Amino acid sequence: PYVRLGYEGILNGAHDIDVAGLNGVEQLAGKFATIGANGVKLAGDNGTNAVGLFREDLGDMVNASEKASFYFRGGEYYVNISRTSLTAAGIAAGDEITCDADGKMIKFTGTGKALGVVTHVGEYRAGNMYEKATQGVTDTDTFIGFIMYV
Amino acid sequence: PYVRLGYEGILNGAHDIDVAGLNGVEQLAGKFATIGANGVKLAGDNGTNAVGLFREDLGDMVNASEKASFYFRGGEYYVNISRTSLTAAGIAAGDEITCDADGKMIKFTGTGKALGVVTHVGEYRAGNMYEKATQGVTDTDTFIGFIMYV
Amino acid sequence: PYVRLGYEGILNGAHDIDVAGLNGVEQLAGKFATIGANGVKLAGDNGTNAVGLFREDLGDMVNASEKASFYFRGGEYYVNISRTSLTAAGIAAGDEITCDADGKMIKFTGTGKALGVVTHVGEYRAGNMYEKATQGVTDTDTFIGFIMYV
Amino acid sequence: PYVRLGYEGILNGAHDIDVAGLNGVEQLAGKFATIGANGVKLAGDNGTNAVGLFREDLGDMVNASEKASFYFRGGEYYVNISRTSLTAAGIAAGDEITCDADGKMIKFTGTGKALGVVTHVGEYRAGNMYEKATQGVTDTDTFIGFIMYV
Amino acid sequence: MSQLSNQEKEYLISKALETEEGRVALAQAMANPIRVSLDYQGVGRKLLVVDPLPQGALPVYDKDVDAKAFVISKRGQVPDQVIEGDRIQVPTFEIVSYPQVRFSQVKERRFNVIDRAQQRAKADIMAVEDAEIFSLLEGAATAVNAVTISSGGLQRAALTKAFQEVEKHDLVVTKIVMNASAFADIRAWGQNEFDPVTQHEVLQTGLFGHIWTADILISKKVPQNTVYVLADPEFVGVMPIRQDIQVIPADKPEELRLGWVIYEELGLAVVNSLAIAKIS
Amino acid sequence: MSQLSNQEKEYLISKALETEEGRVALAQAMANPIRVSLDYQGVGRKLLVVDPLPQG
Amino acid sequence: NTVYVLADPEFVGVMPIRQDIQVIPADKPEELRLGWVIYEELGLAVVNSLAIAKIS
Amino acid sequence: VIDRAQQRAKADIMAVEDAEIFSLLEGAATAVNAVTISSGGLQRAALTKAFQEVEK
């Protein structure tokens, strides 16, 4: 639907908070994560994509990448939530975005189906034997597009 | 306008269309005449020397024969159907004209009872077929200015 | 149908369609010949010899087999009724022609092995049978005539 | 052909079992779709109806309009049985297309109560008549994916 | 960047032959440096491919006139296209790092070379692609194939098949994997299968060079000569541009580097190119 | 510039004109340039040929 | 030995001809490409020619 | 040019086909040498036959 149990009329991201009601840890009503209100840059996208590498703004304020390259820094791999715009079916005017830790649902594109981390070539990927490792909470379902999370 | 009723000369004898076609069709194809105003046809196609065969110039639009009149050549068999009596018909009218086709009533000139040709001037007339029109072993009747239904 | 007025290679004398339709005791839906114009006492004598396959073009003209790209002239089981006249002197296929979907005999083999087409000559000369429109029939005739039926 | 009977067709879907031929009689077995004039290029570019009229250029492959756009077809018309629930437009080459002779429902697209043509692209389009022709009496829906009788 | 919030000062290390850094890539899936380039102004390109040819002449005539038919070729249309690749970089990061600026340039050249290569080989004639190679090569011929044949013998054979077309072909264009497995196969009578010698070879079959492209896929060999078979007409030539005034460069201190070209793609070959697939 | 689809009005007509757009020609597939040629006029040629001979 | 064994007499050489002005172009605008030759073949000593048929 | 050569030299003799050369020429057979052997092998074997004629 438009709001709850999905989100619709969006081109960056799709359906989320299909558990119904909030459950995120350290969440109030969240705060803008931005790439469709224009982030600071997005890293990768080897085809049509709008999943990149994303970055903390030094707190719980989250946005798309603001730091170059792909090196160690703290934090957990969130389930990615994308709320509907208050425009017709365009992007921007999106709703304060609560970051669920283990909600429903995003696509999976690493090694495993409950595991996957985020990398600088876009999408989610499995790890490297040099840096990082794979362990996420990618959920059910699969769909590779500029629309994604179904 | 599209009325069912035959008409593209002087109404007398048969010309009747009540159910369209003798192929099995129900035929309405409208299209423009690319002959503008200036005729005696501005008052409708009637009396002697009028049109009633038309031929597409290899488009989907109509005019009189571009075809040589002393050697036979492959036409496109259209006649212009009734457009209300005593009101413009066929060529010479600068609006959309309704044609039909498929065993329709045609227009003749000259008396001879039967045995008529096509003269590639946009009408059929009295003549001796040997390379020219015939709908059978002989062609249907030829009388001066009247519409005979095939 | 007259068989054995042909010449060496796969060919049959001219076919008059009196069998399975005969115009002179009925009149149907005329349409133009875009082959033929040669022949006396009703042309049609070099429009077709023994009745190929007749296929409607743009508007209402039918014509014989020709082409091998951009709308195959010929094909379907819709055949041109040649009526009773004179054999190889009164073949109708150069005049305005009435067709039906029924008729014998239908010749469809040119000189030498392959499903024939019609050139500028009414008689048949040799195409292909797998790079030319096929109607479900393959010629199994050997050199020197012998009947073909579509 | 030369007829249209609508208002939800003579029967639902892109198949007609109460009709059977109209010009000639049905084709047995289908044929491969190849764009162009049955090139060695099988996908992309222009041609192939996604349930439309077909011509054949080779005697085992079927193809569609390349030459003539906004003017109706020349030679050869072939409806399709099956391929149920495909709206006509785009390309649809590299499929096996099952072909029967005209007398079955196909799929149209364009405006209602207008007469339509064939694009080289593989789509249909429609509008008021200034260069559109052919097809019988208008009865077309504005809703696209309509079951058109040819 | 001199931040410590993610990045370390163990990735920004000074270069001058002391506290040396890597930064090295591997080059595969190429076809462009062999290929010829000429200039041309134009908004589209027209190419011809040969269809199956119906006959209007068949040897069953010696007293029976002609027959209607077409010699057909079909045309494909390619509109002017743009191929380009981008790198978005932090100026501070580039300067501190020292080989990072050099490498970002070479990296953008590698990405432009790949994006060319993908469109040019893949799919059949398209208006959203530079499609050629796949369409132009002729299939695998089964007569060539035999039970218990050599991998090397097949590659020798393939090359003769190409001569029949009347074309230029003077080199073999293989997949990296296929070629290496093909090379490794030694007869049980102890002869190398490519060339019958007991020495190192640089890889030669038919006394012809090997060009290794990784777009060609496994079990595939395609003999051809790039120069005859394709041609790149050029609307505009390569020029690198950098814009820091763009939307994204503004947001935080950054420069955007764009590396581009504008091309059309011409195929001087209607079916000239041939390929065979390995069954060894 | 950029198309988004395989569908084009552009396809129907020439967008560029060159005498080369692709082509083939073969020299070796004909036995007639291989042999020697001379003219003759006449509707036919008359030869006398030898029949079977057992030999010995 | 093709040169001694056979010889090619030419009544007419091969030539293409092109006609835009015949019956079918008149009826509907069409162009015809004409291609023809009139040939004869001479055999100077054809019982030197050997034919073999491949097995494999 | 292919169809003229094809009829005169080879084809078979039918009601629309000729065959001059093929009929006249003398027999020779690879099969005597071996029945089933390589395509290369046939071409090499074939050369020898011509010698016999005094063509060399």
- State the SS3 of chain E: CCCCCCCCCCCCCCCCCCCCCCCCCCCCCCCCCCCCEEECCCCEEEEEEECCCCCCCCCCCCCCCCCCCCCCEEEEEEECEEEEEEEEECHHHHHHHCCHHHHHHHHHHHHHHHHHHHHHHCCCCCCCCCCCHHHHCCCCCCCCCCCCCCHHHHHHHHHHHHHCCCCCCCEEEECHHHHHHHHHCECCCCCECCCCCCCCCCCCECCEEEEECCCCCCCEEEEECHHHHCEEEEEEEEEEEEECCCHHHHHCCCEEEEEEEEECCECCCCCCCCCEECCC
Phi, psi for E161 (deg, rounded to 5): -60, -35
Structural contact between residues C42 and B130, judged by C-beta atoms closer than 8 angstroms: yes
Structural contact between residues B102 and B23, judged by C-beta atoms closer than 8 angstroms: yes
Paired residues of A137 in beta bridges: none
Residue G3 contacts F where some CB pair is shorter than 8 Å? yes
Please give the structure tokens belonging to residue B148: 């005979």
Q: How many whole angstroms separate alpha carbon D85 and alpha carbon D81?
A: 11
Inter-chain CB proximity D120 and F6 less than 8 Å: no
Q: How many whole angstroms separate alpha carbon B98 and alpha carbon B29?
A: 6
Binding-face residues of C in 43-102 toward G, CB within 8 A: 57, 66
Nearest to B122 by CA among B49, B39, B53: B53
Centre a 10 Å sphere on the Cβ of residue D32 and count the other Cβ atoms it contains: 16
Inter-chain CB proximity C77 and D1 less than 8 Å: no
Inter-chain CB proximity H1 and F49 less than 8 Å: no
- Report how far apart, in Å, the C-alpha atoms of C14 and of each of A97, C6, C83, C89 are: 85, 8, 12, 9
Structural contact between residues A23 and A100, judged by C-beta atoms closer than 8 angstroms: yes
Alpha carbon of residue E36 to chain centroid: 13
Resolution limit, Å: 6.1
Inter-chain CB proximity G24 and C57 less than 8 Å: no
HSE at residue C86, side-chain half, CA atoms within 13 A, is 11
Nearest to H19 by CA among H5, H3, H34, H8: H8
**Do at least 3 CB pairs under 8 Å connect D with H?**
no
Centre a 10 Å sphere on the Cβ of residue D34 and count the other Cβ atoms it contains: 25
Q: How many whole angstroms separate alpha carbon B71 and alpha carbon E28?
A: 69
Determination technique for this entry: cryo-EM
Please give the structure tokens belonging to residue F56: 């010995």
Structural contact between residues C20 and C91, judged by C-beta atoms closer than 8 angstroms: no
Inter-chain CB proximity E62 and H6 less than 8 Å: no
Using alpha carbons only, how large is chain B's radius of gyration in Å? 14
Question: Chain G residues with CB inside 8 Å of B71's CB?
Answer: 26
- Ramachandran assignment for D51, one of left (phi > 0), alpha (psi -120 to 50 degrees), beta (any other): left
Before E30, cis peptide (omega within 30)?
no
**Do at least 3 CB pairs under 8 Å connect A with G?**
no
Helix H or strand E encompassing B125: strand B124-126
Inter-chain CB proximity E69 and C127 less than 8 Å: yes
Q: How many whole angstroms separate alpha carbon E221 and alpha carbon A56?
A: 49
**Dihedral of the alpha carbons of E186, E190, E195, E200, in degrees to the nearest 10:** 80
Structural contact between residues E243 and A57, judged by C-beta atoms closer than 8 angstroms: no
Q: How many whole angstroms separate alpha carbon H11 and alpha carbon H24?
A: 13
Sheet of D31-33, strands arranged across: D55-56, D61-63, D31-33, D96-97
Size of interface B-C (CB pairs under 8 A): 89
**Do at least 3 CB pairs under 8 Å connect D with F?**
yes
Question: Chain C residues with CB inside 8 Å of B138's CB?
Answer: 24
Question: Chain E residues with CB inside 8 Å of F9's CB?
Answer: none
Phi, psi for B118 (deg, rounded to 5): -115, 130
Q: Give every CB contact of residue E79 below 8 A, 6+ residues apart in sequence.
A: E43, E44, E45, E127, F1, F2, F3, F8, F10, F15
Structural contact between residues E62 and H16, judged by C-beta atoms closer than 8 angstroms: yes
Centre a 10 Å sphere on the Cβ of residue E27 and count the other Cβ atoms it contains: 11
Structural contact between residues C139 and C109, judged by C-beta atoms closer than 8 angstroms: yes
Instruction: Give burial (CB, 10 Å; 0-12/13-18/19+) of C64.
Output: buried
Q: Give every CB contact of residue B113 below 8 A, 6+ residues apart in sequence.
A: B141, B142
In single-letter form, the type of residue at position E245 comes to: I
Q: How many whole angstroms separate alpha carbon A43 and alpha carbon A53?
A: 5
> Euclidean distance between the first and final Cα of chain A, in Å?
13
Paired residues of B146 in beta bridges: B10
Q: How many whole angstroms separate alpha carbon D66 and alpha carbon D38?
A: 11
Instruction: Give burial (CB, 10 Å; 0-12/13-18/19+) of C30.
Output: buried
Collapsing DSSP to helix, strand or coil, G12 comes out as strand
Question: Chain C residues with CB inside 8 Å of H14's CB?
Answer: 143
Structural contact between residues A134 and A110, judged by C-beta atoms closer than 8 angstroms: yes
Inter-chain CB proximity D44 and E123 less than 8 Å: yes
Inter-chain CB proximity G11 and F40 less than 8 Å: yes
Q: Which of B81-113 are b and which e, b meaning 16 or more Cβ less than 10 Å from the residue's Cβ?
A: bbbeeeebbbbbbeeebbbbbbbbbbbbbeeee
Question: Chain C residues with CB inside 8 Å of H17's CB?
Answer: 112
Please give the structure tokens belonging to residue C80: 């041109």
Q: How many whole angstroms separate alpha carbon E4 and alpha carbon B146?
A: 102
Give the total residue count for chain B: 150
Nearest to A46 by CA among E85, E262, E106: E85
- Report how far apart, in Å, the C-alpha atoms of B102 and of each of B26, B106, B150, C93 are: 10, 11, 10, 17
Alpha carbon of residue D32 to chain centroid: 16
Nearest to D1 by CA among B29, B108, E263, E280: B29
* Angle at which helices E176-184 and E151-163 cross, to 10°: 120
Centre a 10 Å sphere on the Cβ of residue D7 and count the other Cβ atoms it contains: 8
Please give the structure tokens belonging to residue C106: 């239908």
